[PDB]
Design a protein around this ligand. Structure first.
Ligand SMILES: CC1=C(/C=C/C(C)=C/C=C/C(C)=C/C=O)C(C)(C)CCC1
Ligand SMILES: [Cl-]
Length: 218
């Protein structure tokens, strides 16, 4: 199994999620539609990014490594949508959304920038992202959880389930980044991509399926 193959697998998984979310939201009352649309965009954008990488585009040479630019474009656009989904579920107002969305953006921008910087100073960008990430986790586990507590028992339960999925799985990315080509380059590009393809699929499609389950049960 090579990079190309791993990218195709990611494209296929994202496509399956995209189609399922689009279908399940066919009707969608008039206030629940928002959730389905966000899911379609999250997995849809990732699907495109993976096909692009699978076709060999965006493989940017940096120092003695390769940076998959599409992955980062994908993250920058999709992770804020995931955060939006959680904030909607938690019942946040504009100001609340604004804070978590910017922290999220700082994480992804710093990571992309760090990956694109050849020198050892790139770790300074990585650190910036790590710090903003802790801020994001704080909001997810604190204020946003407090806000969610004002919703029905089911919604609060779905929020908690997805919050846990997000906090735990997202916290893993920085380590894979630090151990893979972007950092120490211990893990080969293939192993790093394999691990990240799984993580992207679960944080997006796994995330979506869990939500659909809750919606159905509700
Ligand atoms: C904290 C941290 C990171 C986190 C990345 C995450 C959490 C990515 C999630 C992607 C998803 C959910 C895609 C779909 C980076 C950028 C590796 C580097 C800086 C430190
Ligand atoms: Cl990369």
């Amino acid at each position: 199994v090579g990079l190309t193959t791993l990218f195709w697998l990611g494209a296929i998984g994202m496509l399956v999620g995209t189609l399922a979310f689009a279908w399940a939201g066919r009707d969608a009352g008039s206030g629940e539609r928002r959730y389905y649309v966000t899911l379609v965009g999250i997995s849809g954008i990732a699907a495109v990014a993976y096909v692009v990488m699978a076709l060999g585009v965006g493989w940017v040479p940096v120092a003695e490594r390769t940076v998959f630019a599409p992955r980062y474009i994908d993250w920058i656009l999709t992770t804020p949508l995931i955060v939006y989904f959680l904030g909607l579920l938690a019942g946040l107002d504009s100001r609340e959304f604004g804070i978590v969305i910017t922290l999220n953006t700082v994480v992804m921008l710093a990571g992309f920038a760090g990956a694109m910087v050849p020198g050892i100073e790139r770790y300074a960008l990585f650190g910036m992202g790590a710090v903003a990430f802790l801020g994001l986790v704080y909001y997810l586990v604190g204020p946003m959880t407090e806000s969610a507590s004002q919703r029905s028992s089911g919604i609060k339960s779905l929020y908690v389930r997805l919050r846990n999925l997000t906090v735990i799985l997202w916290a893993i990315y920085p380590f894979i980044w630090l151990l893979g080509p972007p950092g120490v380059a211990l893990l080969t590009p293939t192993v790093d991509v394999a691990l990240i393809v799984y993580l992207d699929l679960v944080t997006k499609v796994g995330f979506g399926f869990i939500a659909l389950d809750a919606a159905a049960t509700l």
